[PDB]
Paper text:
The only characterized MR proposed to pump sulfate in addition to halides belongs to the cyanobacterium [name] and is named [name] ([name]). Here we present the crystal structure of [name] in the ground state, the structure of its sulfate-bound form as well as two photoreaction intermediates, the K and O states.
The [name] protomer consists of 7 transmembrane α-helices (A-G) connected by three intracellular and three extracellular loops like in other type I rhodopsins. As in archaeal HRs, a Cl− ion is found in the RSB region of [name] in its ground state. The ion is coordinated by the T74 and S78 side chains of the characteristic TSD motif and also a water molecule (w401). Notably, the coordination of the chloride ion and water molecule w401 in [name] is tighter compared to NpHR. The extracellular (EC) half of the [name] protomer forms a large aqueous concave basin, protruding from the bulk to R71 (counterpart of R82 residue in BR) and, surprisingly, even further to the RSB counterion D201.
Residue numbers in the entry:
A (entry chain A), B (entry chain A), C (entry chain A): 1 to 225
The structure:
Amino acid sequence: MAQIWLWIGVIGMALGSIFFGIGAHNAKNERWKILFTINFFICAIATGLYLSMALGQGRSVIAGRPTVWVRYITWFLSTPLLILDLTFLGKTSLPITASLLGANAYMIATGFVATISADRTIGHIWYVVSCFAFLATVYLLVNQYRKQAERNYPQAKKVFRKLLSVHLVLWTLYPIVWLLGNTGFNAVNQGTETMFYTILDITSKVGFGFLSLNSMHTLEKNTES
Amino acid sequence: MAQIWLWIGVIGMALGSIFFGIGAHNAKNERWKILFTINFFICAIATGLYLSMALGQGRSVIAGRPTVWVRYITWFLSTPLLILDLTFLGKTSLPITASLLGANAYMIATGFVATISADRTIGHIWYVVSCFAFLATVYLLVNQYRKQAERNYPQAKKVFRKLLSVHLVLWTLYPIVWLLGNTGFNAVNQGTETMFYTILDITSKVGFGFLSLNSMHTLEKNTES
Amino acid sequence: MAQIWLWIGVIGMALGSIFFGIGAHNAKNERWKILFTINFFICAIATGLYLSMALGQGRSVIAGRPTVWVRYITWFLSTPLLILDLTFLGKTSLPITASLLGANAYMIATGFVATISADRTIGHIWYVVSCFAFLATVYLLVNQYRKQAERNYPQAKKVFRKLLSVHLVLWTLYPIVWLLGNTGFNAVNQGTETMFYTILDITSKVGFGFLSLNSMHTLEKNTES
Ligand SMILES: CCCCCCCC/C=C/CCCCCCCC(=O)O
Ligand SMILES: CCCCCCCC/C=C/CCCCCCCC(=O)O
Ligand SMILES: CCCCCCCC/C=C/CCCCCCCC(=O)O
Ligand SMILES: [Cl-]
Ligand SMILES: [Cl-]
Ligand SMILES: [Cl-]
C-alpha cells in the first residue's frame, strides 16, 4: 500500500511540474512567469522527495520505529515556496513575508526534531512547539497578511478568503496525520499514513498551485485598466 | 551546573523573544517592524537551541569528548541576523553586507568543523581558519561598515562606535571560551563552559537586541525633520 | 597522487581568493566590487573544500567504496555563485535567475544523492536526474539567459558566447569524470579522478573568475558614454 502511494506521489508531482513548467515557458508577463516558476519548483522538489521515498530512501529505523526523515528536508524547501505563492499574490510587506517564512521554517525544523527524537516525550514537546509555530503563521495569515492583501485588492477579498481557507484547512491536517501515525498514537498503519501524507502533499502542492494560478487570473481581471 | 544554565538560557531567550515580539507587533513604522522582527527571530532561534540542549539533545561523545554540535547549527542562523542588525542600522551597501554575512558564515562553519573533528590537531587548524574569518569581519566592520555608517549618519558616529565596540568585545570572547573548553586546553569544566556560552549568548542576543533598539531610537531622533 | 592534487587545489584556490580579494578591496565602483566579491567567495569556499579534503576529511567508505561527500556540500554553495557571475553580467531577469539557481541546486543535490547512495542502481538513477537538471540549465542558458544578455548588450554578443561556451564545456566534463570514477565505471583510479576534479575546479573557479572580470571590462568599455 505504502509503495503504490509513493509512486502515485511521484506521478502526481511530476505531472504538476510538467504543467507548471509549460505555463512558465509560455508566460505572457513577468508576474505570471514568477508565479508559474514558484509552483514549478514546489512540485519539482516534491517529485524528488517522492522518488527518493519510492526508491526506499530517506527512512531510518529509530529505536525500532520506522521514520521517514527525508520529507522534512524537502518540506523545508517546498513549504517556503508555498508561502511565497501567498505573499506574491498578496503583495505582502517585507517584515510580514519574512515573519511568515521564519515561522514556517521554525515549524518544519521543529517538526523534524519532533519526528527524529528517539525519546518520544521530547519529540512530543517539539510537536507542541511546532504547532505553536504553525499557530503563529495562522495569526499572521488571517491578520496582517489578509489585511494587506485586502488593502492591495479591495475588490478581491473573496480571492484571499479562498486562498487562506484552503491553505489553513489543508495545512492543519498535517499535524493531525502526524498524531495518528507512528510519531504519535500509531492509530493508523504506515500504509495509511503514507497515503494520507501523499494525498495531502499532492493537494497542497498541485492543487494549491492551480488555485494560485486561478487566483492570479481573478486578481488581474479585477485590476484591468 | 550545566543543566541549570541551559534552562537559564531557555528562559532568557524566551523572554527576549516575547519582548521583541511585542515590540514587532506594536511597531509604528516598517523600519521599526523590521528591526524588532530581526531580533525576535534571533532570540526565537536561540530559545530553540537552548531547549534542545536543556533536553539533552544536540550533543555527541566524539572519541570520548562530549561535544555540543547543535549550537553551530543555530548560530549559523542567528549570527547572520545579528550581522543584519548592524547592516540594517548602518544602511550598509550590498557588497559589504554580503561580505560580512559570507565571512560570518565562514567563521561559524569552520568553527563547527574545528569542534567536531576527532583529530584535534585538524580541529585546531580549523580554529585558526575560523579566527581569520572573524578577523575578516573585524576589518570590514571597523573600516567599510563604519565609514559607510558615519557617512549615512554624520551626527551619530558615537552610536556606531558603541554598537561596534559591544559587538567586537563580546564576539571575541567566544573563541576564548572555545580555547578554555574541552575543544582546546580544557582549562574549565563543562558546567563552567556551559555557563560562559550561556551568558555570552544571552548578552549577544537579548543584550545586543536591546542596544540595537536604543541605537535605532537615537538614529531616528538625530534624523528627525 | 591524490594527496598532492588536493594540496594543489588548496594552493590554487587560495591564490584565486587572494587576487579576487585584492581586486574587491581596490574596486572602483559597486558593480566591480560585487563581481570581485562573488569570485572571492567562490574561491574562498573551494579553498575550504580543498583544505578539508587534503586533511583527510569529507570522505566515507560506503559499502566498501571510498566516497568524497564534502565536495557536494561546498559545490552547493560555490556553484550558485558561479551562476550569479553569469546572471550579474547578463543582467538576467528574476524568474530566469531563480530558475538557473533552482535547477543548479537540483543538479548538485541529486548529484550528492547519486554519489552517496549505497545502491548504485539507485545512485545511477539520480545521476540521470542530475543530468536532466543540468540540461535544464543548458536550455535556460542558451535561450532565455543568452537572449536577455544580447538584448542588454547588443554590441557584446561575443562576450556572452565566450562565457557560455566556457561554462557549458567545462561543466559538462564533471558528469563525465563522475562516470569514469568509482561512482560509475571506475575506469580511472582515485588519484586520477582527484586530479581531474581538481583541475576542473581550479579552471571553473579561478579560470572562470578571471574570464568574468575580463568580460566585465569588455562590457563596460562597450557601454562607455
Ligand atoms: C529556506 C527558506 C528559509 C526561510 C527563513 C526565513 C527567516 C526569516 C527571518 C526574519 C528576520 C529578517 C527580517 C527582515 C530582514 C531584512 C533585512 C534588511 O532589510 O536589511
Ligand atoms: C544563512 C545565511 C548565509 C549567508 C551567506 C552569505 C554569502 C555571501 C556571498 C557573497 C557573494 C555575493 C555578493 C553579492 C551578490 C549579488 C548578486 C547580484 O547582484 O545579482
Ligand atoms: C544556496 C543557493 C540555493 C538556491 C535555490 C534557488 C531556488 C529557486 C526557486 C525558485 C522559485 C522562486 C522564483 C522567484 C520568487 C520571487 C518571490 C517574490 O517575488 O516575492
Ligand atoms: Cl517536498
Ligand atoms: Cl542560536
Ligand atoms: Cl567548492
